Amino acid sequence: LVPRGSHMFIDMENMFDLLKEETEVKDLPGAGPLRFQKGRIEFENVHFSYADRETLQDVSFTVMPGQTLALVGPSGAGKSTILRLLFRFYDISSGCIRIDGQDISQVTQASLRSHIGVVPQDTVLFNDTIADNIRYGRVTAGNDEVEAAAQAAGIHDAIMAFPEGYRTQVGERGLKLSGGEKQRVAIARTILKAPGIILLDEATSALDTSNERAIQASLAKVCANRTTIVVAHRLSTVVNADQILVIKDGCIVERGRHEALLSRGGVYADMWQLQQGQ
Numbered sequence: 001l002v003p004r005g006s007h008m009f010i011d012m013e014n015m016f017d018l019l020k021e022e023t024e025v026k027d028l029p030g031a032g033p034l035r036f037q038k039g040r041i042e043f044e045n046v047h048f049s050y051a052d053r054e055t056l057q058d059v060s061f062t063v064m065p066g067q068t069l070a071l072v073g074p075s076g077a078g079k080s081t082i083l084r085l086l087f088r089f090y091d092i093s094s095g096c097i098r099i100d101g102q103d104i105s106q107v108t109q110a111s112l113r114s115h116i117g118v119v120p121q122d123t124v125l126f127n128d129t130i131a132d133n134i135r136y137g138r139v140t141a142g143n144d145e146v147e148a149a150a151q152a153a154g155i156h157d158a159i160m161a162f163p164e165g166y167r168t169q170v171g172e173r174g175l176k177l178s179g180g181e182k183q184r185v186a187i188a189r190t191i192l193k194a195p196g197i198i199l200l201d202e203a204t205s206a207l208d209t210s211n212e213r214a215i216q217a218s219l220a221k222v223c224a225n226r227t228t229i230v231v232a233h234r235l236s237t238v239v240n241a242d243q244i245l246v247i248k249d250g251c252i253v254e255r256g257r258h259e260a261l262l263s264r265g266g267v268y269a270d271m272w273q274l275q276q277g278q
């Protein structure tokens with residue numbers, strides 16, 4: 001058969017390109033680098049939808065440079081989505097997201113992400129030396145910098161007990177890192193990238209008490225003077241956050257510090273009373 005109408009001019013290579021899965025986001029022509037100053041974050045009246053329910057509805061907030069904002073709320077509320085949007089994994093249908101006064105949709109995605117450290121629920125380990133796994137944070141970094149990141153992340157000492165030190169093959173085809181060593185690797189990667197903003201999605205598993213306390217101290221280290229948004233599962237994170245947004249069905253139903261949320265007696269307070277069990 002002879003393809004007719006518009007079909008005679010269709011480009012098959014374009015049809016195969018459109019079949020691909022993560023169909024993603026474009027830099028707008030002429031976009032320059034994010035001019036990052038101190039990492040102030042702003043969501044103004046943000047709306048977003050994956051499908052036919054709005055996932056996020058009129059979501060507004062600010063994170064001042066160096067402050068931590070915790071997202072909490074029921075499953076499916078849209079917490080993780082918020083981090084995704086700041087990374088510009090997706091575009092928003094309305095409203096505006098800014099870093100230091102600049103629409104994140106109008107700078108290069110490359111520069112945007114160069115200033116963001118993502119600490120994910122769980123850690124991709126590559127089939128590579130422990131040193132190259134850390135260097136993943138910033139590929140051009142010196143060995144000295146890898147060791148400094150590892151030192152700050154609390155993993156240097158475990159690594160020195162490995163049979164080939166920093167050269168020890170890890171991942172699937174290498175030495176098994178413990179669950180705690182893997183988390184520390186993600187931390188070391190982030191310390192090495194040295195971003196001005198951290199996006200932290202807390203693991204919903206936990207390790208033993210003393211390890212959990214150690215990892216939590218190492219995380220608080222990486223976040224301490226960086227603007228941070230955390231999807232918070234741990235009560236200690238929320239207690240110590242500079243601000244908490246309580247999200248329910250895509251809407252920020254309440255916000256403030258821990259103590260002010262408790263004294264408000266609303267949904268957060270209900271959560272805290274329930275976990276307390278007095």
Ligand SMILES: Nc1ncnc2c1ncn2[C@@H]1O[C@H](COP(=O)(O)OP(=O)(O)O)[C@@H](O)[C@H]1O
Binds near residue numbers: 051055074075077080
């Ligand atoms: N990739 C996706 N495609 C379609 N819907 C999604 C996708 N990811 C999450 N969702 C939906 O968006 C809503 C928000 O999910 P999410 O941001 O993960 O919430 P939380 O982090 O509060 O658990 C949920 O209803 C979820 O089912």
Ligand SMILES: [Mg+2]
Binds near residue numbers: 076
């Ligand atoms: Mg969830």
